[PDB]
Design a protein around this motif. Structure first.
Motif, PDB file in Angstrom:
ATOM      1  N   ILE A  52       2.692 -11.807  -2.461  1.00  0.00           N
ATOM      2  CA  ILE A  52       2.800 -10.315  -2.721  1.00  0.00           C
ATOM      3  C   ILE A  52       3.479 -10.348  -4.062  1.00  0.00           C
ATOM      4  O   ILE A  52       4.353 -11.093  -4.562  1.00  0.00           O
TER       5      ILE A  52
ATOM      6  N   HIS B 245       0.099   4.172   0.750  1.00  0.00           N
ATOM      7  CA  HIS B 245      -0.319   4.934   2.033  1.00  0.00           C
ATOM      8  C   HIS B 245      -0.597   4.215   3.013  1.00  0.00           C
ATOM      9  O   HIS B 245      -1.706   3.020   2.464  1.00  0.00           O
ATOM     10  N   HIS B 246      -0.207   3.924   4.023  1.00  0.00           N
ATOM     11  CA  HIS B 246      -0.660   3.009   5.282  1.00  0.00           C
ATOM     12  C   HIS B 246      -2.042   3.259   5.635  1.00  0.00           C
ATOM     13  O   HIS B 246      -2.418   4.358   5.889  1.00  0.00           O
ATOM     14  N   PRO B 247      -2.600   2.308   5.717  1.00  0.00           N
ATOM     15  CA  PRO B 247      -4.017   2.062   5.997  1.00  0.00           C
ATOM     16  C   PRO B 247      -4.209   2.503   7.344  1.00  0.00           C
ATOM     17  O   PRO B 247      -5.485   3.007   7.901  1.00  0.00           O
ATOM     18  N   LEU B 248      -3.158   2.361   8.522  1.00  0.00           N
ATOM     19  CA  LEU B 248      -3.790   2.739   9.865  1.00  0.00           C
ATOM     20  C   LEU B 248      -3.429   4.389   9.866  1.00  0.00           C
ATOM     21  O   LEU B 248      -3.996   4.861  10.964  1.00  0.00           O
ATOM     22  N   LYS B 249      -2.964   4.902   8.869  1.00  0.00           N
ATOM     23  CA  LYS B 249      -2.823   6.227   8.736  1.00  0.00           C
ATOM     24  C   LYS B 249      -3.959   6.840   8.176  1.00  0.00           C
ATOM     25  O   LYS B 249      -3.895   7.790   7.009  1.00  0.00           O
ATOM     26  N   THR B 250      -4.969   6.729   8.556  1.00  0.00           N
ATOM     27  CA  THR B 250      -6.489   7.041   7.846  1.00  0.00           C
ATOM     28  C   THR B 250      -7.593   7.168   9.104  1.00  0.00           C
ATOM     29  O   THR B 250      -7.390   6.672  10.248  1.00  0.00           O
TER      30      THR B 250
ATOM     31  N   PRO C 119      -9.001   1.818   3.027  1.00  0.00           N
ATOM     32  CA  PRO C 119      -8.176   1.112   3.954  1.00  0.00           C
ATOM     33  C   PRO C 119      -8.695  -0.070   4.873  1.00  0.00           C
ATOM     34  O   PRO C 119      -8.144  -0.921   5.527  1.00  0.00           O
TER      35      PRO C 119
ATOM     36  N   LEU D  46      -4.740  -5.696   4.638  1.00  0.00           N
ATOM     37  CA  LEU D  46      -4.228  -6.546   5.668  1.00  0.00           C
ATOM     38  C   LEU D  46      -3.059  -6.242   6.183  1.00  0.00           C
ATOM     39  O   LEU D  46      -2.054  -5.605   5.516  1.00  0.00           O
ATOM     40  N   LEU D  47      -2.844  -6.418   7.539  1.00  0.00           N
ATOM     41  CA  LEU D  47      -1.631  -6.282   8.106  1.00  0.00           C
ATOM     42  C   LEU D  47      -0.846  -7.611   8.530  1.00  0.00           C
ATOM     43  O   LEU D  47      -1.505  -8.227   9.152  1.00  0.00           O
TER      44      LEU D  47
ATOM     45  N   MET E 200       0.689  -1.261   0.014  1.00  0.00           N
ATOM     46  CA  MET E 200       0.138   0.158  -0.045  1.00  0.00           C
ATOM     47  C   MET E 200       0.859   1.241  -0.005  1.00  0.00           C
ATOM     48  O   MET E 200       1.633   1.388   0.874  1.00  0.00           O
TER      49      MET E 200
ATOM     50  N   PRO F  35       2.719  -2.159  11.284  1.00  0.00           N
ATOM     51  CA  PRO F  35       2.686  -3.230  10.579  1.00  0.00           C
ATOM     52  C   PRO F  35       2.712  -3.087   9.040  1.00  0.00           C
ATOM     53  O   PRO F  35       2.070  -2.001   8.501  1.00  0.00           O
ATOM     54  N   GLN F  36       3.333  -4.148   8.285  1.00  0.00           N
ATOM     55  CA  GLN F  36       3.353  -4.020   6.740  1.00  0.00           C
ATOM     56  C   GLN F  36       2.035  -4.232   6.361  1.00  0.00           C
ATOM     57  O   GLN F  36       1.282  -5.112   6.741  1.00  0.00           O
ATOM     58  N   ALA F  37       1.438  -3.355   5.462  1.00  0.00           N
ATOM     59  CA  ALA F  37       0.219  -3.482   4.964  1.00  0.00           C
ATOM     60  C   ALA F  37       0.199  -3.793   3.500  1.00  0.00           C
ATOM     61  O   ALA F  37       1.053  -3.394   2.870  1.00  0.00           O
ATOM     62  N   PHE F  38      -0.963  -4.541   3.116  1.00  0.00           N
ATOM     63  CA  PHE F  38      -0.968  -4.957   1.825  1.00  0.00           C
ATOM     64  C   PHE F  38      -2.588  -5.006   1.494  1.00  0.00           C
ATOM     65  O   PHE F  38      -3.357  -5.199   2.289  1.00  0.00           O
ATOM     66  N   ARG F  39      -2.779  -4.966   0.009  1.00  0.00           N
ATOM     67  CA  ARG F  39      -4.173  -4.767  -0.451  1.00  0.00           C
ATOM     68  C   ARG F  39      -4.271  -5.918  -1.485  1.00  0.00           C
ATOM     69  O   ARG F  39      -3.339  -6.056  -2.461  1.00  0.00           O
ATOM     70  N   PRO F  40      -5.200  -6.940  -1.538  1.00  0.00           N
ATOM     71  CA  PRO F  40      -5.431  -7.657  -2.483  1.00  0.00           C
ATOM     72  C   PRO F  40      -5.389  -7.090  -3.992  1.00  0.00           C
ATOM     73  O   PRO F  40      -6.106  -5.845  -3.867  1.00  0.00           O
TER      74      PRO F  40
ATOM     75  N   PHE G 206     -10.438   8.795   4.624  1.00  0.00           N
ATOM     76  CA  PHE G 206      -9.463   9.730   4.448  1.00  0.00           C
ATOM     77  C   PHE G 206      -8.056   9.773   4.861  1.00  0.00           C
ATOM     78  O   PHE G 206      -7.904   9.070   5.868  1.00  0.00           O
TER      79      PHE G 206
END
Lengths: 213, 216
Positions: free
Chosen positions: A192, A129-134, B134, B138-139, A127, A160-165, B164
């Motif tokens: 990955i 942009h990190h998903p936790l930073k939202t 987001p 997955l993390l 990702m 944590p390393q974040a990934f999106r399908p 956002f």
């Protein structure tokens, strides 16, 4: 009912005739059919469509075709499995919209599937942009941190390393897919892939970008 | 002391990555200038301070008629804290305005300000919509775990809350709070929503041309 490793390529007719648009002489459909074949991972490779033009292209590739009447991905896969009458083994969804996803990617992804644990193996990319930073909008006046407000200021390197399908591959235990009625089954493992190889064909630029690659 | 509304523009001269980026011209005006102009036009600040370590950035800053604090040759919070201490303000509001968001205007700042609450004094941060949702991620938990529900991974856009991300353009905070908490995200943080185009962050040559093209 002996277990069989089945590959399902959902490819509708109606980008106009997107699945038939060619990339270096081979259709988007053909590219994914070729990855499935070259992967050597499947006992059966089925293309589920709703148009002879797609079906004809599928047959030309030496693969099975499942025509769909009148009219959801999981529904297509479930239908295809019932059509060939398979309810045991593995089933992999390979969307034609991921031309850069090769036979080799499939083998690597499949090598991660655990026959005993039966969790999903889903290809995914990093990702930006990190998903936790939202934050999520509760309403016009409230937005809640994805997790902790403090995360928004944490270095992603420290998160944590974040990934999106990326949609190119979904490998599942057949019985578990049929039962849960979904592509993600715990415990999910991810294969990955680079962002380059995860290109999702949607527009013309995409078809240009992927080919160049 | 009397409350003051402070704008702090952190702009180093020797920009890591795109060299001398802040002084880099985008349609005639320096990147720093665009942000200083937004600060000036906003009419929301009593004091506007450019914090820097380059004489050329300082020069540009003074040319726009704003204050300058020279910093020695979590680092943002320290820079803002240093600027505040330097001008001797520990009361009012403090807004960080990064020069890397040249398309964030004075109106955007004015609009952002109307969301700040003087009693609860929570942060006000500009943010833009997230391209990839987001919740559909997955993390690595070392195994992989869904952000929330696995089911979420299979949900269409408009069946999930809108998401956002801060875009870096604006961070408004009560001054005593920012100082006490030593961070930019404080209680009841409210977001000021901005479009993707207006949120463009300048980090590369392409961004530069992209920001220009957008204005043209």
């Amino acid at each position: 009912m002996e277990k069989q490793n089945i590959a399902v390529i959902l490819a509708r007719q109606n980008l106009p005739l997107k699945n038939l648009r060619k990339m270096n002489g081979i259709s988007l459909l053909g590219h994914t059919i070729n990855a499935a074949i070259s992967s050597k991972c499947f006992d059966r490779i089925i293309v589920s469509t709703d148009g002879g033009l797609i079906a004809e292209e599928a047959k030309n590739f030496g693969v099975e075709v499942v025509l769909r009447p009148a009219e959801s991905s999981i529904s297509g896969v479930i239908h295809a499995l019932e059509t060939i009458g398979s309810n045991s083994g593995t089933v992999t969804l390979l969307q034609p919209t991921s031309p850069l996803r090769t036979g080799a990617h499939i083998r690597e992804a499949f090598s991660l599937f655990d026959e005993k644990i039966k969790g999903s193996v889903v290809s995914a990319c990093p990702m930006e942009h990190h998903p936790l930073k939202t934050l999520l909008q509760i309403n016009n006046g409230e937005y809640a941190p994805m997790r902790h407000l403090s995360d928004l200021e944490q270095p992603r390197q420290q998160l944590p390393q974040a990934f999106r399908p990326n949609g190119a591959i979904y490998i599942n235990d057949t019985a578990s897919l049929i039962a849960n009625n979904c592509f993600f089954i715990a415990p999910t493992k991810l294969y990955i892939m680079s962002h380059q190889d995860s290109i999702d064909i949607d527009t013309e630029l995409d078809l240009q970008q992927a080919e160049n690659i």
